[PDB]
Ligand binder design. Structure first.
Ligand code: NDP
Ligand code: MOT
Length: 186
């Protein structure tokens, strides 16, 4: 309906997950920022849609499932029905976007947030149209078993600044990271 965005935390070796979880120790402020970006809606009486693969759903601690104040959609071709706590189930990303245009959700949804995993990001990244990437750069190498797709800099531009995103290097548990905003339109 509105804006389509991807949001991801990545290590310096482009790693995003190791055994069902994050490769680095928990960053409470990095988690808070994911929460704030995905939950805030720009319009009244409207909520954001969160779209994720099934192994991403199963890595959110059970006590936080479904993500509060968000419409939670799970992607999977194997599942018969949405997992317990999930609001919707889709077989592909074109179908999940064909769904926000149903009067059911059409008047309800402001932004669309892709929250992973690899397979999901890869396809959003090739979708034609306006898209923004929200990338947290975790500045060290971490042994990973799942990786973020290559960002094609001939198509995506790094923005010099973005409203409500801090520009400086953060530090938490001795780890440095920074926030980037990339924009495409083709
Ligand atoms: N650092 C960060 O930002 C992030 C880290 N993570 C972490 O990364 C890993 C999650 O990994 P990843 O394996 O890539 O998993 P996904 O969450 O992408 O799960 C893959 C499953 O999702 C379904 N699916 C994925 N893409 C599609 C599609 N286009 N259409 C329909 N179904 C699809 C399929 O389920 P089926 O097999 O049922 O058809 C596929 O087997 C974890 O280790 C997690 O903690 C996750 C997201 C962000
Ligand atoms: C593995 N993922 C993907 C994930 C984690 O960190 C990220 N950080 C970024 N920048 N992008 C993402 N996609 C992720 C997640 C795992 C658990 C929760 C979760 O518990 N979220 C609570 C967090 C609340 C909190 O930390 O208090 C929420 O309300 O959003 C979210 C995402």
């Amino acid at each position: 309906v509105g804006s389509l965005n991807c949001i991801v935390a990545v290590s310096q070796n482009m790693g995003i997950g190791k055994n069902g979880d994050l490769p680095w120790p928990p960053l409470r402020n990095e988690s808070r920022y994911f929460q704030r970006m995905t939950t805030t809606s720009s319009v009244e009486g409207k909520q954001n849609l969160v779209i994720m693969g099934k192994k991403t759903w199963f890595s959110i601690p059970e006590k936080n499932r479904p993500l509060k104040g968000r419409i939670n959609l799970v992607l999977s071709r194997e599942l018969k029905e949405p997992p317990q706590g999930a609001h919707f189930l889709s077989r592909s990303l074109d179908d999940a976007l064909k769904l926000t245009e149903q009067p059911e959700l059409a008047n309800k949804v402001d932004m669309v947030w892709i929250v992973g995993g690899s397979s999901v990001y890869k396809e959003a990244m090739n979708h034609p149209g306006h898209l923004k990437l929200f990338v947290t750069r975790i500045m060290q190498d971490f042994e990973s078993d799942t990786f973020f797709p290559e960002i094609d800099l001939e198509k995506y531009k790094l923005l010099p600044e973005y409203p409500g995103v801090l520009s400086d290097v953060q530090e938490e548990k001795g780890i440095k990271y920074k926030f980037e905003v990339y924009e495409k339109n083709d």
